Design a protein around this ligand. Structure first.
Ligand code: ADP
Ligand code: MG
Length: 462
């Protein structure tokens, strides 16, 4: 079957690149998302600049440049990072930003497919004495890096971070409103970041830092047994540096297998505790996986691999951007499904400067990135539409409200490749509704108190 790189070339509309307008929007996303995971995950307040230039008017080629102050990239890792598409998606053991498996490499591939300039990289790891520079292409036939230029320059006191520029076919007039909306919505749940955006018309927007409070980062965990299939077991075995016995393999390579549990799993699966794991047959792997799926006594997938926005930042962002009369939020306790942890957070903003409409403004997030297209098909949209807001104190048919929901997990379920809608998985839908109801009860209280005070002034004051 086809490699991911070859599947993308044939089916770019399934990977976020159906046309030049979406190509331009998706490239901006990939760059900003890499810069955020290079900063806040490592304790650094993100300082990020985004520029888009029209470089060829008739052919509509645009150059996209994103600069950050993150941890940088060891020079020997650069060529593969941007110029070699992996043969598969690796098992997720830590929460990260992004929907697409190819990541920034899809923008690089699209660039080399349709025009002639190389991508431009400048990077400096923490404490580096040099900034390392590169001009690079991916070989569209071979799936390997081509180093066009490679250099370095003396660094300055305290500097670290990365600059990436990519030249692509685009369509700014079509993409414009959705690119502005992408950046706005990122800023709402990232009030500790600072952004500068210069667009192709020369317009500049400044999005200032509002706080220095950064949420606890996600941590790497070992895989949970309910999450691994036969091929993933094989990958884990082949990766071992040491000659583990099956027993040693169970306790050291997985979540929720202590000494006693391992003994039980081994008996149930008809396996020898002291047999070397590199010698496990195909039949023996099948029994292991079937034992995993049947075993009823594992701890829930650990939430150590996840990272929340937090009630305090959600509320701060909603207040500063919308200037509402009221705002409230909830970060729920962790759940789990199919061997992976998940958490839902929700928020509402009401009144004030928010526009009068007949429906709420709905904001959707997944592992800290906004979802922009395909909103009417999303489970979050369904849950919000189905709630009866009259039960929660909203009285007119016309009102001023923003609602947001964030889902985080090491396995986000999407409906269709190339659409930005979260699937209607029962366990997740139920928890999103529980969360929205928790926040809506806080609104019901606000509104009941407000109406009491208005009635009191009307009836008791001269
Ligand atoms: N701005 C950056 N700062 C630090 N590292 C980066 C940056 N951009 C890309 N990288 C590195 O290159 C790797 C490949 O990027 P990408 O193709 O988007 O895959 P992914 O983000 O899913 O890991 C990243 O995992 C990261 O290590
Ligand atoms: Mg990425």
């Amino acid at each position: 079957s086809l490699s991911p790189a070859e599947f993308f070339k044939r089916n770019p509309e399934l990977a976020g690149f159906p046309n030049p307008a979406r190509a331009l929007y998706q490239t901006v996303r990939e760059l900003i998302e890499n810069s955020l995971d290079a900063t806040d995950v490592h304790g650094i307040l993100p300082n990020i600049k985004i520029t888009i230039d029209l470089i060829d008017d008739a052919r509509q080629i645009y150059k996209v440049n994103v600069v950050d102050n993150g941890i940088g990239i060891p020079p020997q890792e650069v060529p593969n990072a941007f110029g070699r598409v992996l043969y598969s998606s690796k098992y997720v053991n830590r929460q990260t930003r992004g929907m697409y498996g190819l990541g920034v490499k899809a923008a690089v591939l699209y660039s080399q497919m349709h025009q002639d300039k190389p991508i431009e990289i400048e990077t400096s790891p923490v404490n580096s004495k040099r900034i390392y520079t590169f001009k690079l292409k991916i070989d569209i036939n071979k799936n390997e890096p081509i180093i066009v230029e490679r250099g370095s320059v003396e660094n300055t006191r305290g500097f670290h971070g990365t600059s990436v520029a990519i030249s692509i076919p685009g369509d700014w007039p079509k993409a414009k409103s959705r690119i502005y909306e992408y950046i706005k919505r990122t800023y709402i749940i990232t009030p500790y970041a600072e952004f500068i955006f210069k667009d192709p018309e020369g317009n500049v927007t400044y999005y200032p830092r509002l706080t220095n409070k950064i949420p606890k980062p996600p941590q790497e965990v070992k895989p949970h047994p309910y999450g691994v299939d036969r091929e993933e077991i094989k990958i884990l075995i082949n990766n071992l540096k040491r000659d583990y016995t099956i027993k040693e393999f169970l306790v050291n390579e997985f979540q929720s297998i202590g000494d006693t549990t391992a003994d039980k799993i081994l008996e149930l699966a008809g396996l020898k505790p002291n047999k070397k794991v590199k010698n496990l047959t195909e039949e023996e792997i099948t029994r292991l996986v079937e034992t995993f799926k049947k075993y009823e006594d594992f701890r829930s997938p650990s939430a150590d691999s996840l990272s929340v926005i937090g009630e305090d930042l959600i509320e701060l962002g909603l207040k500063k951007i919308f200037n509402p009369d009221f705002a409230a939020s909830i970060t729920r306790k962790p759940k789990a499904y199919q061997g992976h942890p998940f958490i839902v957070e929700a928020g509402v903003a009401f009144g004030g400067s928010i526009p009068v409409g007949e429906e709420p403004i709905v904001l959707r997030y997944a592992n800290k990135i906004p979802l922009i297209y395909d909103e009417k098909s999303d489970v979050i949209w369904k849950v919000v539409e189905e709630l009866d807001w009259k039960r929660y104190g909203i009285e007119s048919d016309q009102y001023q409200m923003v609602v947001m929901v964030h889902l985080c997990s090491t396995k986000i379920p999407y409906k269709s490749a190339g659409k930005e809608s979260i699937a209607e998985v029962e366990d997740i839908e139920k928890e999103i509704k529980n969360a929205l109801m928790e926040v809506a009860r806080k609104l019901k209280q606000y509104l009941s108190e407000k109406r009491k005070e208005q009635e009191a002034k009307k009836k008791l004051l001269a």
